[PDB]
């Protein structure tokens, strides 16, 4: 979505 | 007849548009989830997750929503909370954009910023801390695991696609973040409408955890720039059983594809829309998929 | 059945949503034109003005659009030009936002910036200069006077309102920029559907040229911040004969109303949406309008 | 729209 993790 | 009680009920009924400069002989068609309250597909799960919590008694008059989200889900929950009169707190890394902050604050969100360096772990940790402090007061809706997520896609997104294609859809291509979209759509078309389509999940080549998992190789998440997909784990709201194919796309291809959607199709979609189209275009140019109607979810708009 | 040949045909079918914190007993209902390609009502006239120019032979394969617009019309024309494969030049004061510039450039527009100090006069002057240089090559679509403008509102916007209210609409409140919206809607409901509703035009108190004109007083335009309305003249696409009432709204009220739409209704609308709602709310709280269904155009979204 | 005039 935004940072479930990382991104 | 057609006056919504509030903005939450205005969700969906998004258009299908055929692409001219992708696919082959017009076999690639896109569903524009940017044409929604709050400008993305998350409006659907923001709505349904609230509705379901109300029906099952977990959300009542008075109680307050708390959620860790650095993305469209936050905007979606905020708009629904505003429309239906709920207090809402959203936790998120302090590194969030001023744009996004201002928009959330404007929607009336209690924004709780966490340590940037700690990323989403930070935000989730704080969200849980807040809830611990008064569990009878705060409710966490949990987009990654809440069945209301794929449920709305089964009842709305999937049926809209069946409907607008006159049951002629053969392939659905969707990026996976929570997995709600592909799961819901797939169950609707395969199980409710009885059609054995090809469901294609899309994820970053930089964080290809679904491909690794299904191949039995070491799962190695990584950073990428395709906002909305590549959680770096398999979410509970991705039903692996309904996934026929997994396609990987790189950040740069995803970006360039979105720019091409804008300049060549006049379609204002996000980077994850780029990722989904690139994947679909690749399938569309394989002889196997030449007579197939491929439907691609574009999850959000570009401002 | 429902797959658009290109993004231009996806226009309209925008939702009606009842307001909770405006009007009286739910008598104020809004039509969200933000839920459109390119995020505003101008998508409709961008589409139709191109379609009409194609039908009447004034726009052909090869020829290029040229237009002076510092607003939603530019974005609308750009998206349609992109979708249908036209070159397009847009002239505008150099003082335009980087956001807007980047978006237009991204849509593939040839952006021609004019002297900021000279404002729109500057931009229109340059547009005419460009056309003079090769009239067989360039076409100016002319939003303020082109009948295709109110024509799309007569065929789509007005009928959508008739349809979704089950013919129960009693008042239409719309801000006037080109006047296309109120004119088109009004002709549809009054002349095509035969209902004697109240058509209410909305303009800035700071530039109340329609009110001055109809009162026979000196017309004195002025600056204001309600983007999309208050052209400072009467446009040819405003049919004064179909206007029953003219309401004036101030920039600050318009702004605060938009912020209230966001925080209290969860509806993401522009400042001109604020102006339209403030005007409608005022009518809605007069005993005369208590049993009346008032429909308010919200022309655009807020990002 | 943007600046028919002024704004």
Overall geometry of chain A comes to flat
- Helix tally of chain B equals 9
Radius of gyration of chain A: 4 Å
Tell me the Rg of chain B in angstroms: 19 Å
The end-to-end span of chain A amounts to 9 Å
Coarse morphology of chain B: globular
Q: Share of helix among residues of chain A?
A: under 10%
Strand order of the largest sheet of chain B: 2-3-11-8-9-10
Q: What class do helices, strands and sheet pairing of chain B give?
A: alpha/beta
- Strand residue content of chain B: 15-25%
Beta strand % of chain A: under 5%
Question: What is the terminal separation of chain B in angstroms?
Answer: 32 Å
What top-tier CATH class of the largest domain in chain B fits best?
A: Alpha Beta
Protein name (chains B, C): Cysteine synthase
InterPro entries (chains B, C): Cys_synth, Cys_Synth/Cystath_Beta-Synth, CysK, P-phosphate_BS, TrpB-like_PALP, TrpB-like_PALP_sf
GO cellular component, one term (chains B, C): cytoplasm
EC number (chains B, C): 2.5.1.47
């Amino acid at each position: 979505i935004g940072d479930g993790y990382e991104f | 007849m057609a006056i919504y009680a509030d903005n939450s009920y205005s969700i969906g009924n998004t258009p299908l548009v055929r692409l001219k400069h992708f696919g082959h002989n017009g076999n690639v068609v896109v569903k524009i989830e940017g044409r929604n309250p709050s400008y993305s597909v998350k409006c659907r799960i923001g709505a349904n997750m609230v509705w379901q919590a109300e029906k099952d008694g977990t959300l009542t008059k008075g109680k307050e929503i708390v959620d860790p989200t650095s993305g469209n889900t936050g905007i979606a929950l905020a708009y629904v909370a505003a429309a239906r009169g709920y207090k809402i707190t959203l936790t998120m890394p302090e590194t969030m954009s001023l744009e996004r902050k201002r928009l959330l604050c404007g929607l009336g969100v209690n924004l709780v910023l966490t340590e940037g360096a700690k990323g989403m772990k930070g935000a989730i940790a704080k969200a849980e801390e807040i809830v611990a402090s008064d569990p009878s007061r705060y409710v966490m809706l949990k987009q990654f695991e809440n069945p209301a997520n794929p449920q709305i896609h089964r009842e709305t997104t999937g049926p809209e696609i069946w409907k607008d294609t006159d049951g002629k859809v053969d392939v659905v291509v969707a990026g996976v973040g929570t997995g709600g979209s592909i799961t819901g759509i797939s169950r609707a078309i395969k199980l409710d409408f009885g059609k054995q389509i090809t469901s294609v999940a899309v994820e970053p080549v930089e964080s290809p955890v679904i491909s690794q998992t299904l191949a039995g190789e070491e799962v190695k998440p990584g950073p990428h720039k395709i906002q909305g997909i590549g959680a770096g784990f398999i979410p509970k709201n991705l039903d692996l059983s309904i996934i026929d194919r997994v396609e990987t796309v790189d950040s740069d291809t995803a970006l360039a594809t979105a720019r091409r959607l804008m300049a060549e199709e006049g379609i204002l979609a996000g980077i994850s829309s780029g990722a989904a189209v690139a994947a679909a275009d690749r399938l569309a140019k394989l002889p196997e998929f030449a007579d197939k109607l491929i439907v691609v979810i574009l999850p959000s708009a570009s401002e």
